[PDB]
Structures are given as structure tokens and as C-alpha cells.
Amino acid sequence: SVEGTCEECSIDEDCKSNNGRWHCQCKQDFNITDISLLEHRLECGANDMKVSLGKCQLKSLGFDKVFMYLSDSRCSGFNDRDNRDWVSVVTPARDGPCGTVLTRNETHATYSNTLYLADEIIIRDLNIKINFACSYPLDMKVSLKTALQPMVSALNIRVGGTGMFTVRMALFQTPSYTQPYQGSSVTLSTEAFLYVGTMLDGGDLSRFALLMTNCYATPSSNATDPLKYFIIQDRCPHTRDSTIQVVENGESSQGRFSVQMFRFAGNYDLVYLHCEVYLCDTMNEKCKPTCSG
Amino acid sequence: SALNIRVGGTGMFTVRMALFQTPSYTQPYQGSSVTLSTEAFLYVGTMLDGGDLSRFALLMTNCYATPSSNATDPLKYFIIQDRCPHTRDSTIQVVENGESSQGRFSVQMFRFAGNYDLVYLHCEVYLCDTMNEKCKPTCSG
Amino acid sequence: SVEGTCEECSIDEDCKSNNGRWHCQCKQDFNITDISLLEHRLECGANDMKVSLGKCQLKSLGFDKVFMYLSDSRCSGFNDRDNRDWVSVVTPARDGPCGTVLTRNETHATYSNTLYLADEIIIRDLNIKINFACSYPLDMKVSLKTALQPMVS
Ligand SMILES: *[C@@H]1O[C@H](CO)[C@@H](O[C@@H]2O[C@H](CO)[C@@H](O[C@@H]3O[C@H](CO[C@H]4O[C@H](CO)[C@@H](O[C@@H]5O[C@H](CO)[C@@H](O)[C@H](O)[C@H]5NC(C)=O)[C@H](O)[C@@H]4O[C@@H]4O[C@H](CO)[C@@H](O[C@@H]5O[C@H](CO)[C@H](O)[C@H](O)[C@H]5O)[C@H](O)[C@H]4NC(C)=O)[C@@H](O)[C@H](O[C@H]4O[C@H](CO)[C@@H](O[C@@H]5O[C@H](CO)[C@@H](O)[C@H](O)[C@H]5NC(C)=O)[C@H](O)[C@@H]4O[C@@H]4O[C@H](CO)[C@@H](O)[C@H](O)[C@H]4NC(C)=O)[C@@H]3O)[C@H](O)[C@H]2NC(C)=O)[C@H](O)[C@H]1NC(C)=O
Ligand SMILES: *[C@@H]1O[C@H](CO)[C@@H](O[C@@H]2O[C@H](CO)[C@@H](O[C@@H]3O[C@H](CO[C@H]4O[C@H](CO)[C@@H](O[C@@H]5O[C@H](CO)[C@@H](O)[C@H](O)[C@H]5NC(C)=O)[C@H](O)[C@@H]4O)[C@@H](O)[C@H](O[C@H]4O[C@H](CO)[C@@H](O[C@@H]5O[C@H](CO)[C@@H](O)[C@H](O)[C@H]5NC(C)=O)[C@H](O)[C@@H]4O[C@@H]4O[C@H](CO)[C@@H](O)[C@H](O)[C@H]4NC(C)=O)[C@@H]3O)[C@H](O)[C@H]2NC(C)=O)[C@H](O)[C@H]1NC(C)=O
Ligand SMILES: *[C@@H]1O[C@H](CO)[C@@H](O[C@@H]2O[C@H](CO)[C@@H](O)[C@H](O)[C@H]2NC(C)=O)[C@H](O)[C@H]1NC(C)=O
Ligand SMILES: *[C@@H]1O[C@H](CO)[C@@H](O[C@@H]2O[C@H](CO)[C@@H](O)[C@H](O)[C@H]2NC(C)=O)[C@H](O)[C@H]1NC(C)=O
Ligand SMILES: *[C@@H]1O[C@H](CO)[C@@H](O)[C@H](O)[C@H]1NC(C)=O
Ligand SMILES: *[C@@H]1O[C@H](CO)[C@@H](O)[C@H](O)[C@H]1NC(C)=O
């Protein structure tokens, strides 16, 4: 048009501009013949089927006027009216109108129809008819979007059970803590080094650490005895004794303390070992006590 | 002389289902979620928003509920098993299925056993051609 | 079973015997509903927690098939396999598996989990969920059994 600017013509096709001579054409993108003959696009809709070809392709192929017809002449092509580059026709997805037929097999149905293309009403050299069909699945997945939150009169009852963990300690001979003892009693000398370690036979949670809050020896099996020799006092070993060394405590489930043998002063011949232990959570507590060792 | 070139296009039909309140199937819901009680009766129907061909009938091959939106879940409660409703539950009644495009099944609300609070509904459907298939399944209801 | 005698069925539940008609049921000991709803037993283990209810109670309450589930559906109930009267489920005493959580305070830690009971997958009238927890002391007394007899010059 001699009034509208580049917006007057389709954006896809270049808008040529010169003094006293304005027009719009296309580029190498849509310029060739053979691929244009092979060029097309199709759209299968829920209720309609659309087939379109580039109008610039038709113009370049010499088809200034385009006549699009189907098996039924009542169906006729027309401009896209949405994107001006294309020219398209519509066909209802049924059998009987617009010349469409229904091809059905067990898997899923299909609709087939033919499109006739020509430059004019009559055909002189080539009669190109496009055979096209849309396949619609006969089985499909459907999901309800809206979820549900049902209400029920529920009965909730608290149950509480006391539990106890399993804890044991062993007397090892070597500094490597290899062989536990099994006899009910043992004999040793003062110069002998008493290597002892503790273990949890169950509940070896990674975040639960073993911390010796305090340890002591007793002349008798009865823990409640006034004569106590604290080996670990308030999470740390007793000082003034170089022989007291602990390799690990609170690092993991394996808590080991090293000390040499001793004997209570008096008529007490037998010596027992007792300990108190606090399980430490690594999430919050550092579980690595530090003191004036 | 004529040139013929084959063209094919993958398409899909439009299918949707709605949750009605009344036994007459009048008002669909619109909210993303709803709350209900066990005694409440869950009336549901399915419709085709397009392609309402007279000879294509709607047949519920199987329906089931899922605790989550993901259909591929082992915990499935089949409400319709192989084109027929699950027995041992008098509350399961379907007014129409395969007669026309309007397939409706009636059941009362339920809740999955466990920690699952939300329940979803999924279905599979087979379109039936009235020309050849009777499309009126019969079974030991 | 039409082959095994009274030993075939659990001793706790009475074994009924008649010509052409044998079976086993229970007595007034396990027959009522309300106390059965209130009846249960729990066991807190060192590494596992067990909760069980009388199978005869479930049968008498109309729950011919029993579905026991927890906060995590991977955990499922099963027969006791030690005393056939009970039916029980197991849960490791940790946080994360089987839906269990860890409730901790300064005195001592505690593990809590919920048990879901139903006759079938779906629930129609009542949704009874049993909230249970085991308390494990965080401080405990340990004594070495083996005494010592040191030698001195
Ligand atoms: C019912 O009915 C219905 C109807 O509808 C059905 O269904 C259907 O079916 C049909 C048939 O099968 C189909 O079609 C097919 O397809 C396939 C696949 O495809 C592929 O590819 C593509 C591309 O191309 C892709 O993508 C696509 O695309 C499209 C476009 O194109 C679109 O549309 C869509 O969308 C897409 N897809 C989707 C899914 O979406 C796909 O994916 C696929 O992929 C891949 O690819 C590859 C490559 O290509 C492949 O491989 C290759 O292939 C070739 C062909 O292509 C060959 O085969 C070779 O060998 C191979 O290696 C693979 O495989 C795939 N994957 C899978 C499968 O997975 C296809 O494959 C086919 O093809 C065939 O066929 C055709 C026809 O039809 C033919 O063509 C022919 O050719 C010749 C030469 O060769 C000439 O001459 C002529 O002319 C032509 N035409 C006619 C014949 O017509 C071809 O070739 C082939 O054939 C054969 O093959 C063999 C092997 O096996 C050989 O050996 C032989 O040789 C041949 N033949 C001859 C003759 O030669 C077709 O195309 C449809 O699809 C359906 N539908 C649906 C919806 O799907 C049903 O089934 C019924 N039922 C009852 C029961 O009946
Ligand atoms: C960190 O967290 C741990 C959590 O484990 C905590 O340690 C536990 O604390 C609880 C609370 O103290 C302990 O359980 C209390 O035991 C008290 C004394 O023992 C009772 O009860 C035993 C049965 O529970 C019984 O026999 C025991 O039976 C077990 C089998 O079931 C067996 O395994 C065990 O060996 C055996 N022996 C024991 C345990 O020694 C005992 O023989 C003895 O009779 C008991 O008095 C307590 O009852 C009070 O507390 C509970 C809540 O814990 C209340 O329950 C509430 O009741 C309401 C109705 O009244 C109801 O609506 C609520 O739903 C319900 N639940 C709540 C509130 O959570 C009780 O009613 C009662 O509460 C108050 O009592 C006062 C005075 O009597 C009364 O005036 C109030 O009215 C009443 N409250 C209310 C709301 O009415 C518990 O049963 C547990 O034993 C501890 N664990 C261990 C391993 O010992 C730590 O302390 C905690 N630490 C910190 C720092 O926070
Ligand atoms: C095809 O592409 C050509 C681009 O070469 C379009 O116009 C041509 O422009 C060049 C400018 O360098 C001229 O030398 C050519 O003479 C032009 N083509 C002709 C045929 O004169 C052309 O418009 C595009 N479309 C068609 C249908 O040829
Ligand atoms: C509950 O206890 C009764 C005992 O009275 C069990 O069976 C009953 O046996 C008496 C025999 O005097 C019959 O008169 C009753 O008819 C029996 N009960 C029924 C329901 O018929 C009974 O098996 C026990 N358990 C249950 C679940 O009822
Ligand atoms: C341990 O000793 C204390 C006090 O000496 C006493 O009260 C307690 O009964 C004793 N216990 C045993 C088991 O000997
Ligand atoms: C659904 O669950 C299956 C298996 O449980 C899984 O393979 C799939 O990825 C899941 N899909 C979605 C969307 O969650």
C-alpha cells in the first residue's frame, strides 16, 4: 500500500523501501522451488484440522492466485487471519463433512483427507494433491487436578514404654584393644598396664557419642561404697598421675582409657571397676571436653 | 500426471472430568482443593470438550484413586476394575457408562489408610464405536 | 485345618472340637470391644521397638484382615512368629527410617512414632492411629562383672 509503512506488509517477508517505489518481498529463507514444493505445515486440533503453506512460496512459484480445494468443493481455503504469512483451510474432525473419511483400527482411529492445489480452476501441467491425515489416540491418560482433603473422626491414644539401652565394657590386654577377657576373675601385677574400653552392643547411632562423665574403682562389687578412687573426675582424668592416658573419649562409640594396675590400701584384696557415662549428641554439643590435663 | 506426497500429523483429543455435588450432576467445582466427610456422597462425571461424535461412546476401562498426583504409584484403589465396578461395596453405583459421552460413577468419600492426607482421582477410558461394538459391558455386578 | 489337632491352632484361643465340625475361637478373656480398643502391648528394645495387639481381638472387632501402617508406608505389620496370638510390627530405633522422629531433652532422649490401624486400605467410619513412644535413659549405671586380683610384693 502507498500509505502504510513496513507494518502494512507481513514482518516475515522483508519490506523493501525506496523513493517513489515501495514494496515487500522475501529472502533466501523462502525463495526456492523444490523445497517449497516439499514445504508445508499441518496442525491437528481437538475439533478441527488445519493445513497451511507459505503464501510467499506460492507467489514465488508463479501461483499469484491460490485455489485450495478438498474432496468436497464446499470446503475452500482462505487467509490465515492470525499470522498473515500463512494461508490455511479448516476441516471438522468428523466423517461426511468436508469430504473427510474415518480410518479406524484397534490401536487408535485416524482421519484422512486430500487437499487439491492449483493456480486456477483448470489444470494444465501438474495436478498436485496433498494427502494428509491426523492420528488421534483412542486411549489416553486423564488426571483430576483438584485434590481432596477428607475429614475423619480419628482416635489418637498416647502409649509410653520405658526402654533401656545396652552398654558393656571389656578389659583388653594389648594397647591395640584386641582380645577381651572372659573369666570371672583375673590376676595381674602393678607394673602391668590395664587397658580398658567401652562399647555399645546396640543403638550405635552416628550422632550419639560416648562421654565418660566420671569413672572410679571400688574394693567391692557394691557401687555405693565411700572408698572411691576416681580415675575420671567430671569428664576429665585425675591429674598428678602421668600413667593416666585416654586415647579417645567422646569422639565415637569407642571410649578407651589407659592406666596401670593398682591396689587399694588395707585388707581389701579384690578391686572392681565402675563408670558413669553420658551419651552426647554431635548435632548440638561439641562432645570434645577440654581441661587442664 | 499427478504427484502424491504422504503427510501425517500427531493429534490428541480433549478430555476432562468434573466433581459434581448433587446427584443430578449440576455444578462443577473450581477450587484447587476441597474438603469433605466420609458420609458425603462423591458424585463424579466425565465429558468430552470436543469431538462429541454420536458413534463414539465413553467406556471406563478402569478407574482408581491415588494418594498423590503422580499416577504411577503402587498404592492404587481400583474403583472400576476391567470395565466394571469393584464388588463388595454397595456404595459403588454408576448410572451410565458407554451409553453416550456422559460417563458418571457414584461413590461415597474415602481416605487412604496411613499418613496420606490428600487423595487424588485418576481414570483410564476407552472410546467405543457403536457401529461394531455393543459398548454395553455386562458382568457379575 | 482339617488335619492338625488342637496344637494346630494357638493355645491361648480355645480349640473347639465336634464331629464333622472343628474350629478354634476365644473366650470372655478376649471377647469385648471397648477394652479391646483400649487393649494393646508395647516392647522397647535396645535396637528396635515392637507394638502388638491380640489377633483374636482384631477378628472379634470385625477386622478379619488387618492392615498396620506407620508414618512411612515401607513399614508394614506382620505375624508375631514367636507367640502366634499376637501380631506385631518392628521399627528401628533411629530417626529417618520407618518414619520415626527423635525427641530429645536434657534429662534423656525419646523416640516417637505413630501407628495406623484399619480393616482395609480405605477408611470409612473411624481412623484410629496409635501414638506411641519409647523413652531411653541417657545416663545409666554400668558395672564391670569380672573382678581383679592384683599381685604386690
Ligand atoms: C493403526 O493406524 C495408525 C495410523 O496412524 C498406526 O499408527 C501409526 O503407525 C505409523 C506406522 O508405523 C507411524 O508412522 C511411523 O513412525 C515411525 C516413527 O517415526 C520416527 O521418526 C520420526 C521422525 O521422522 C520421529 O518424530 C516424529 O516426527 C513426526 C514427523 O515425521 C511427527 O509428526 C511426530 O510428532 C514425531 N513423533 C512423535 C512420537 O511425536 C518419531 O519419534 C520416530 O522417532 C524415531 O525415528 C528414527 C529415525 O526415523 C526411527 O528409526 C528409523 O526410522 C526409519 C523410518 O523413519 C526406518 O524405519 C529405519 O529403518 C529406522 O532405523 C526410530 O525407529 C523412531 N523411533 C521409534 C519408532 O520409537 C517411523 O519409523 C515409521 O517409518 C516406517 O514406516 C514408513 C511408512 O509408514 C516408511 O516410509 C516409507 O519408506 C520407504 C523407503 O524406506 C518409501 O519408499 C515409502 O514411500 C515410505 N512411505 C510409505 C511406505 O508410506 C518408513 O521407511 C518406515 O518403514 C519401514 O521401516 C523398516 C524398519 O523398521 C524398514 O526396514 C523398511 O524398509 C521401511 N519400509 C519401507 C517400505 O522401506 C512410520 O513413519 C505413526 O507414527 C503411527 N501413529 C502415531 C500417532 O504414532 C497404528 O499402529 C495402527 N494400528 C494397527 C493395529 O494397525
Ligand atoms: C524429657 O522427656 C521425657 C519424656 O519421656 C521425660 O521423661 C518421662 O516423663 C514422663 C512425665 O513425667 C513420665 O511419665 C509420667 O510418669 C509419672 C509417674 O509414673 C506413673 O505412671 C506410670 C505410667 O505412665 C506408672 O507405671 C509405669 O508404667 C509403664 C507402662 O505404661 C512402665 O513401662 C513403667 O515401668 C511403669 N513405671 C514407671 C514409669 O515408673 C507408674 O507406676 C506411675 O503411676 C506420671 O505421674 C505421669 O502422669 C502425668 O503426666 C502425664 C503426661 O506425661 C499426664 O498425661 C496427660 O493426662 C491428661 C489428662 O489428665 C491428658 O489430657 C493428656 O493428653 C496426657 N498427656 C500429656 C499431658 O502429655 C498425666 O495426666 C499426669 O499429669 C499430671 O499429674 C498431676 C499430678 O499427679 C495432675 O495434677 C495433673 O492433672 C496431670 N496432668 C494433666 C494434664 O492432667 C507420667 O505418666 C515418664 O515415665 C518419663 N520417662 C521415663 C523413662 O521415666 C523427662 O522427664 C523430660 N525431661 C525434661 C527435663 O523435660
Ligand atoms: C530471491 O532472492 C533474491 C536475492 O538475491 C531476491 O532479489 C534479488 O536481489 C538481488 C540483489 O543483489 C538482485 O541482484 C536480483 O536480481 C534479485 N532477484 C531477481 C529475480 O531479480 C528475490 O526477490 C528473491 N525472491 C525471488 C522470487 O527471486
Ligand atoms: C464370646 O463368648 C461366647 C461365650 O458365650 C462365645 O461363644 C458363645 O457360646 C455360647 C455357649 O453358651 C453361645 O450360646 C453363644 O451363642 C456363643 N456366641 C455367639 C456369638 O454365638 C464367643 O465365641 C466369644 N466370642 C465372640 C466374638 O463372641
Ligand atoms: C551398698 O552399700 C550401701 C551403703 O554402704 C548400702 O546402702 C546398700 O544396701 C549396699 N548394696 C549392696 C547391694 O550391697
Ligand atoms: C511417579 O512414580 C514413579 C515410580 O514411583 C516414578 O518412576 C516417576 O518418576 C514418578 N513421576 C512423578 C512425576 O513423580
Side-chain angles (χ1 to χ4, degrees), chain A residues 35-52:
Chain A
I35 294 88
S36 163
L37 289 157
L38 279 76
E39 186 273 319
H40 62 82
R41 56 169 290 254
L42 190 145
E43 181 173 343
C44 302
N47 293 330
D48 294 77
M49 316 190 301
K50 188 194 296 189
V51 188
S52 74

Side-chain angles (χ1 to χ4, degrees), chain C residues 60-114:
Chain C
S60 62
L61 287 173
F63 304 159
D64 53 11
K65 301 189 291 299
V66 67
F67 277 108
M68 305 182 75
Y69 288 80
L70 308 182
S71 179
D72 193 316
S73 172
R74 273 73 64 78
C75 283
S76 55
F78 58 100
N79 291 282
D80 185 51
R81 199 173 51 82
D82 287 356
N83 213 23
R84 301 292 181 179
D85 53 328
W86 313 103
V87 65
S88 76
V89 68
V90 61
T91 69
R94 303 201 306 283
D95 180 17
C98 207
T100 305
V101 296
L102 178 141
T103 307
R104 189 273 311 282
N105 62 20
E106 58 185 0
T107 311
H108 60 79
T110 314
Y111 295 168
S112 66
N113 196 315
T114 298

Side-chain angles (χ1 to χ4, degrees), chain A residues 220-226:
Chain A
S220 63
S221 66
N222 187 7
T224 301
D225 186 303

Side-chain angles (χ1 to χ4, degrees), chain A residues 2-293:
Chain A
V2 302
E3 301 80 348
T5 69
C6 184
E7 94 303 332
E8 192 278 345
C9 187
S10 172
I11 300 102
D12 299 331
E13 62 191 329
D14 186 10
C15 52
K16 300 295 181 177
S17 182
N18 281 115
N19 297 333
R21 204 135 170 268
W22 290 266
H23 60 284
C24 58
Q25 214 67 12
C26 305
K27 298 285 178 59
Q28 281 82 1
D29 300 5
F30 312 134
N31 236 20
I32 196 155
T33 64
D34 299 329
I35 294 88
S36 163
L37 289 157
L38 279 76
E39 186 273 319
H40 62 82
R41 56 169 290 254
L42 190 145
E43 181 173 343
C44 302
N47 293 330
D48 294 77
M49 316 190 301
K50 188 194 296 189
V51 188
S52 74
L53 282 74
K55 196 158 183 156
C56 202
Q57 299 282 59
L58 274 288
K59 290 185 176 295
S60 62
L61 287 173
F63 304 159
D64 53 11
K65 301 189 291 299
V66 67
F67 277 108
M68 305 182 75
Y69 289 80
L70 308 182
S71 179
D72 193 316
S73 172
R74 273 73 64 78
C75 283
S76 55
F78 58 100
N79 291 282
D80 185 51
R81 199 173 51 82
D82 287 356
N83 213 23
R84 301 291 181 179
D85 54 328
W86 313 103
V87 65
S88 76
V89 68
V90 61
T91 69
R94 303 201 306 283
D95 180 17
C98 207
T100 305
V101 296
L102 178 141
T103 306
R104 189 273 311 282
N105 62 20
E106 58 185 0
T107 311
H108 59 79
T110 314
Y111 295 168
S112 66
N113 196 315
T114 298
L115 166 63
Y116 294 109
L117 175 60
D119 195 2
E120 207 161 6
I121 301 299
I122 55 167
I123 306 175
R124 294 295 198 187
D125 300 358
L126 284 70
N127 172 35
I128 297 169
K129 62 187 182 175
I130 302 288
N131 286 350
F132 65 93
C134 283
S135 299
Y136 290 112
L138 194 74
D139 278 322
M140 55 184 291
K141 308 302 205 181
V142 62
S143 61
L144 178 57
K145 305 295 291 184
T146 69
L148 318 176
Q149 186 166 2
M151 298 287 92
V152 295
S153 299
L155 318 186
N156 289 337
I157 74 104
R158 198 84 59 78
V159 182
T162 59
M164 188 170 285
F165 268 116
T166 184
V167 184
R168 58 183 179 76
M169 65 181 67
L171 174 62
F172 298 109
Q173 304 180 8
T174 60
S176 48
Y177 308 93
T178 52
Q179 54 271 19
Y181 278 95
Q182 284 78 245
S184 177
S185 307
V186 74
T187 299
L188 289 174
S189 65
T190 60
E191 304 299 329
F193 295 92
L194 180 138
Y195 304 98
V196 169
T198 59
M199 293 293 291
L200 296 92
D201 198 55
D204 195 334
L205 286 76
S206 66
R207 59 182 170 180
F208 283 0
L210 207 61
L211 191 150
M212 296 288 170
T213 189
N214 55 49
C215 280
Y216 59 86
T218 316
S220 63
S221 66
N222 187 7
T224 301
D225 186 303
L227 186 58
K228 307 174 197 174
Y229 175 54
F230 293 106
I231 186 72
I232 297 169
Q233 184 63 255
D234 192 0
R235 310 188 177 203
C236 284
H238 186 268
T239 181
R240 295 179 63 268
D241 186 2
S242 60
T243 60
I244 309 175
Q245 295 181 11
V246 300
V247 65
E248 296 198 349
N249 184 12
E251 297 190 0
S252 168
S253 163
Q254 196 189 27
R256 291 155 282 158
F257 58 89
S258 67
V259 71
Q260 61 177 21
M261 191 62 191
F262 55 88
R263 186 186 192 284
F264 282 121
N267 200 0
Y268 305 111
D269 288 326
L270 304 176
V271 57
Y272 294 71
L273 287 171
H274 300 150
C275 279
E276 310 300 346
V277 62
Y278 186 91
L279 281 74
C280 193
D281 192 353
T282 59
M283 296 190 296
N284 308 84
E285 292 79 358
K286 53 176 157 176
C287 309
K288 180 56 59 56
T290 57
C291 47
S292 59

Side-chain angles (χ1 to χ4, degrees), chain C residues 28-39:
Chain C
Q28 281 82 1
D29 300 5
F30 311 134
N31 236 20
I32 196 155
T33 64
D34 299 329
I35 294 88
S36 163
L37 289 157
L38 279 76
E39 186 273 319

